[PDB]
Amino acid sequence: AANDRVSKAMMDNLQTETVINRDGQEEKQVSFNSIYMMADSGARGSAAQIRQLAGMRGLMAKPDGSIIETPITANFREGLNVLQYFISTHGARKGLADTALKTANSGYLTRRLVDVAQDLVVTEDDCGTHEGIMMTPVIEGGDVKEP
Amino acid sequence: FQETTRVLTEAAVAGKRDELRGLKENVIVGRLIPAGTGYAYHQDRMRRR
Amino acid sequence: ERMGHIELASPTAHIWFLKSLPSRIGLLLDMPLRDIERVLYFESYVVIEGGMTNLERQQILTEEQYLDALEEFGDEFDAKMGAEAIQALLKSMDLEQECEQLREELNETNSETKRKKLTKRIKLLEAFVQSGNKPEWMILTVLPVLPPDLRPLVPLDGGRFATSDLNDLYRRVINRNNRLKRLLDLAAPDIIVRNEKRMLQEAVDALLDNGRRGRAITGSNKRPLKSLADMIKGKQGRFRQNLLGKRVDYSGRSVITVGPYLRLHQCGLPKKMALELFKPFIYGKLELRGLATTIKAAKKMVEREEAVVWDILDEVIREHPVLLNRAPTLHRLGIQAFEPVLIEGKAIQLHPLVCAAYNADFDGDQMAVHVPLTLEAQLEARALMMSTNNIL
Amino acid sequence: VYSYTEKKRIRKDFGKRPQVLDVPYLLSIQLDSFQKFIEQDPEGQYGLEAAFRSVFPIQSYSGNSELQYVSYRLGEPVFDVQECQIRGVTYSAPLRVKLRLVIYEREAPEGTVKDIKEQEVYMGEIPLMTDNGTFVINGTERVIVSQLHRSPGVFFDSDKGKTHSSGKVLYNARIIPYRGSWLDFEFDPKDNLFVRIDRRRKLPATIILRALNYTTEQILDLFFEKVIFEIRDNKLQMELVPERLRGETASFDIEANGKVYVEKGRRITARHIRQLEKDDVKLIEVPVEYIAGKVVAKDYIDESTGELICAANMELSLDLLAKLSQSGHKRIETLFTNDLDHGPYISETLRVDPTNDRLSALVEIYRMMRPGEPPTREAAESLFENLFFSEDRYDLSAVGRMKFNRSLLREEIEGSGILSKDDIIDVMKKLIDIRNGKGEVDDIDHLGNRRIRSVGEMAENQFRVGLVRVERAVKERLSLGDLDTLMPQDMINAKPISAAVKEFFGSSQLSQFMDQNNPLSEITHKRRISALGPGGLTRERAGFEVRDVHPTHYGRVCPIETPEGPNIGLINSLSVYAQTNEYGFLETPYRKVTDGVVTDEIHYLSAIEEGNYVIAQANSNLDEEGHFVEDLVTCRSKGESSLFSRDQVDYMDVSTQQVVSVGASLIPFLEHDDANRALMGANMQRQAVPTLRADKPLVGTGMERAVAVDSGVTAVAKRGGVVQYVDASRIVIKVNEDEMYPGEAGIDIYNLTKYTRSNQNTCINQMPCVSLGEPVERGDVLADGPSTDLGELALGQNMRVAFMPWNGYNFEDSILVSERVVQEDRFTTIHIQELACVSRDTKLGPEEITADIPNVGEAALSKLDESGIVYIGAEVTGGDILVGKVTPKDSSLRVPNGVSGTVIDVQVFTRDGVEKDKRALEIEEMQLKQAKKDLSEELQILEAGLFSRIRAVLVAGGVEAEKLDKLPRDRWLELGLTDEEKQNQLEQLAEQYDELKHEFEKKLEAKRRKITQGDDLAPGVLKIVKVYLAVKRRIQPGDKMAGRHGNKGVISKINPIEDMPYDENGTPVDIVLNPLGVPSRMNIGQILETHLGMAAKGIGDKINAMLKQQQEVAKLREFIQRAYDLGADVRQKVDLSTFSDEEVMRLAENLRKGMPIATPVFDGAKEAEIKELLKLGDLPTSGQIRLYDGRTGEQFERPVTVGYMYMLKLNHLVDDKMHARSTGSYSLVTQQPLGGKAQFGGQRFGEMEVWALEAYGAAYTLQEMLTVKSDDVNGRTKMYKNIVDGNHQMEPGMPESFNVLLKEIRSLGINIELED
Amino acid sequence: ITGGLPRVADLFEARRPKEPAILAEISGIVSFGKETKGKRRLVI
RNA sequence: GCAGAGGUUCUAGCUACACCCUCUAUAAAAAACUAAGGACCACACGA
DNA sequence: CTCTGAATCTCTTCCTCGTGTGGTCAGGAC
DNA sequence: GTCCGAAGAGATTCAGAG
Ligand SMILES: [Mg+2]
Distance D855 CA to F5 C1' (A): 26
Q: What is the 3-state secondary structure (H, E, C) of D685-715?
A: CCCCCCECCCCCCCEECCCHHHHHHHCCCCE
Q: Which residues contact D246 (CB under 8 A, 6 or more apart)?
A: D273, D338, D340, D341
* Domain termination site, one of D999, D1033, D1067: D1033
A109 interaction partners in chain E (CB closer than 8 Å): 5, 8-9, 12
D53, D59, D484, D487, D499 from D99: Cα distances, Å? 11, 15, 16, 10, 20
Do D533 and D452 share a structural domain?
yes
Q: Which residues contact D984 (CB under 8 A, 6 or more apart)?
A: none
- Give the DSSP per-residue string, D542-605: --HHHHSPPTT-TTTB-SS----STTTTTT-BBBSS--B-SSS-B-EEEEEE-SSSEEEEEEEE
Using CA coordinates, name the residue in chain C closest to A113: C330
d(CA D466, CA C170): 33
E15 CB and strand H closer than 7 A: yes
Using CA coordinates, name the residue in chain B closest to A121: B35
Indicate which technique resolved this structure: cryo-EM
| Closest to D1222 (Cα-Cα) out of C276, E3, C172, C13 | C276
Expressed in angstroms and rounded, the spacing between residue D569 Cα and the centre of ligand 1 is: 21
d(CA D620, CA D559): 21
C117 CB and strand F closer than 7 A: no
φ, ψ of residue A99 in degrees (nearest 5): -70, -35
Domain limits at D1204?
656-712+788-827+1034-1217
CATH of the domain at D644: 2.30.150.10
Do D637 and D515 share a structural domain?
no
Q: What is the 3-state secondary structure (H, E, C) of D311-338?
A: CCCCECCHHHHHHHHCCCCCEEEEECCC
* Domain termination site, one of D1217, D1244, D1270: D1217
Residue C361 burial (C-beta neighbours within 10 Å; 0-12, 13-18, 19+): middle
Expressed in angstroms and rounded, the spacing between residue C380 Cα and the centre of ligand 1 is: 29
- Considering only the beta carbons, identify the residue of D618, D641, D1166 that sits closest to A79: D1166
| Closest to D346 (Cα-Cα) out of D163, D170, D168, D191 | D191
Confirm or reject contact between B23 and chain A (CB < 8 A).
yes
Do D242 and D145 share a structural domain?
no
Q: Which residues contact C114 (CB under 8 A, 6 or more apart)?
A: none
Q: Is residue D5 part of a domain?
A: no
d(CA E40, CA D1284): 81
Do D555 and D520 share a structural domain?
yes
Q: Which residues contact D392 (CB under 8 A, 6 or more apart)?
A: D386
Expressed in angstroms and rounded, the spacing between residue C360 Cα and the centre of ligand 1 is: 6
Do D1089 and D1164 share a structural domain?
yes
With b for 16 or more beta-carbon neighbours within 10 A and e for fewer, the D296-325 pattern comes to bbbbbeeeeeeeebbebbbebeeebbebbe
Angle between helices C279-289 and D1273-1283 (to 10 degrees): 40
d(CA D261, CA D278): 12
Do D336 and D238 share a structural domain?
yes
CATH of the domain at A62: 1.10.132.30
Q: Which residues contact D684 (CB under 8 A, 6 or more apart)?
A: D1042, D1046, D1048, D1208, D1210
Q: What pairing do the DSSP bridges indicate for beta strands D615-616 and D651-653?
A: parallel
Find out whether C363 is annotated in a ligand binding site: yes
Sign of CA dihedral D49, D52, D57, D63: negative
| Closest to D335 (Cα-Cα) out of D347, D350, D323, D318 | D347
Residues 557-576 of D with CB under 7 A from strand F: 563-567, 571
Q: How many CA atoms lie within 13 A of D1073 on its CB side?
A: 28
Q: Beta partners for D308?
A: D301
Q: Beta partners for D801?
A: D1071, D1203
C287 CB and strand F closer than 7 A: no
Q: Is residue D3 part of a domain?
A: no
| Given resolution (angstroms) | 3.7
Do D998 and D1144 share a structural domain?
no
C242 CB and strand F closer than 7 A: no
B37 CB and strand G closer than 7 A: no
Find out whether A128 is annotated in a ligand binding site: no
Find out whether C185 is annotated in a ligand binding site: no
Sign of CA dihedral D416, D420, D422, D426: positive
d(CA B14, CA C27): 13
Following CA atoms D509, D510, D511, D517 in sequence, which dihedral angle do they give, to the nearest 10 degrees? 120
D590 interaction partners in chain A (CB closer than 8 Å): none
d(CA C286, CA C279): 10
Residues 529-548 of D with CB under 7 A from strand H: 540-541, 543, 545
Amino acid at C49: E
| Closest to C238 (Cα-Cα) out of D1244, D1298, D1234 | D1298
With b for 16 or more beta-carbon neighbours within 10 A and e for fewer, the C49-87 pattern comes to bbeebebeebbbbeeebbeebeeeeeeebbbbbbbbbbb
D835, D841, D855, D923, D1025 from D920: Cα distances, Å? 17, 18, 24, 5, 9
**DSSP secondary structure code for residue E22 in this structure:** P
**CB pairs < 8 Å spanning B and C:** 54
CATH of the domain at D728: 2.40.50.100
E38 CB and strand H closer than 7 A: yes
d(CA D32, CA D45): 14
CA angle centred on D342, ends D337 and D347, rounded to 5°: 60
Q: What pairing do the DSSP bridges indicate for beta strands D172-176 and D153-157?
A: antiparallel
**Nearest-neighbour CA in chain A from E4: distance (Å):** 10
Q: Which nucleotide is nearest to C365 (CA to C1')?
A: F47
Confirm or reject contact between C377 and chain D (CB < 8 A).
yes
Do D338 and D384 share a structural domain?
no
Q: Do chains D and B touch (3 or more CB pairs under 8 A)?
A: yes
φ, ψ of residue D972 in degrees (nearest 5): -100, 50
d(CA D974, CA D988): 10
* Domain termination site, one of D411, D443, D475: D443
Assess contact for D821 and D815: CB atoms under 8 A.
Answer: no
Helix-, strand-, coil-residue percentages of chain B, each rounded to 5: 55, 0, 45
Chain A interface disruption, residue of E1, E2, E8, E11, most A CBs within 10 A: E8
Q: Which residues contact D137 (CB under 8 A, 6 or more apart)?
A: D90, D127, D502, D505, D506, D511
Residue D665 burial (C-beta neighbours within 10 Å; 0-12, 13-18, 19+): buried
| Closest to D21 (Cα-Cα) out of D458, D798, D648, D600 | D600
Helices (H), D838-910: 858-863
Helix (H) or strand (E) holding D763: strand D763-764
d(CA D811, CA C352): 7
Confirm or reject contact between D1308 and chain C (CB < 8 A).
yes
Q: Does C330 sit within 8 Å of A103, measured CB to CB?
A: no
Following CA atoms D970, D974, D979, D981 in sequence, which dihedral angle do they give, to the nearest 10 degrees? 100
Q: Does C140 sit within 8 Å of D812, measured CB to CB?
A: no
Q: Is residue D1211 part of a domain?
A: yes
Domain count, chain D: 9
Q: Which residues contact B48 (CB under 8 A, 6 or more apart)?
A: none
Assess contact for D334 and D295: CB atoms under 8 A.
Answer: yes
Cβ atoms within 10 Å of C97's Cβ, excluding its own: 9
Do D861 and D815 share a structural domain?
no
d(CA D1281, CA D1268): 12
Q: Which residues contact D362 (CB under 8 A, 6 or more apart)?
A: D211, D375, D377, D380, D381, D383, D384
- Considering only the beta carbons, identify the residue of D559, D656, D1075 that sits closest to A93: D559
- Give the DSSP per-residue string, D153-184: EEEEE---SSSTTT-----EEEEE-SSS--EE
Amino acid at D998: H
Chain D interface disruption, residue of C261, C291, C301, C374, most D CBs within 10 A: C374
Q: Does D675 sit within 8 Å of A34, measured CB to CB?
A: no
Cβ atoms within 10 Å of D871's Cβ, excluding its own: 13
Q: Is residue D9 part of a domain?
A: no
d(CA D960, CA D954): 7
d(CA C348, CA C342): 10
C247 CB and strand F closer than 7 A: no
Residue C266 burial (C-beta neighbours within 10 Å; 0-12, 13-18, 19+): buried
Helix (H, G, I), strand (E, B) or coil at A115: helix
Assess contact for D1077 and D1203: CB atoms under 8 A.
Answer: no
Domain limits at A60?
1-94
Which nucleotides of chain G have an atom under 7 angstroms from any protein CB? 2-9, 11-26
Do D1061 and D1132 share a structural domain?
yes
Helices (H), D107-242: 205-211, 216-223
Following CA atoms D1302, D1305, D1308, D1313 in sequence, which dihedral angle do they give, to the nearest 10 degrees? -50
Q: Which residues contact D529 (CB under 8 A, 6 or more apart)?
A: D145, D146, D147, D148, D452, D557, D571, D572, D573, D574
**DSSP secondary structure code for residue D259 in this structure:** E
C10 CB and strand G closer than 7 A: no
φ, ψ of residue C310 in degrees (nearest 5): -70, -45
Assess contact for D333 and D227: CB atoms under 8 A.
Answer: yes
D1244 CB and strand F closer than 7 A: no
End-to-end CA distance of chain C: 48
Do D1081 and D1190 share a structural domain?
yes
Long-range Cβ pairs for the range D942-945 (8 Å, 24+): D942/D746, D942/D747, D943/D993, D943/D996, D943/D997, D945/D745, D945/D746, D945/D747
φ, ψ of residue D524 in degrees (nearest 5): -65, -25
Residues 1009-1068 of D with CB under 7 A from strand F: 1048
| Closest to D1250 (Cα-Cα) out of B42, A111, C356 | A111
Q: Is residue D562 part of a domain?
A: yes
d(CA D1139, CA D4): 11
Assess contact for D1069 and A33: CB atoms under 8 A.
Answer: no
Distance D462 CA to F36 C1' (A): 50
Do D628 and D591 share a structural domain?
yes
Sign of CA dihedral D1205, D1206, D1210, D1214: positive
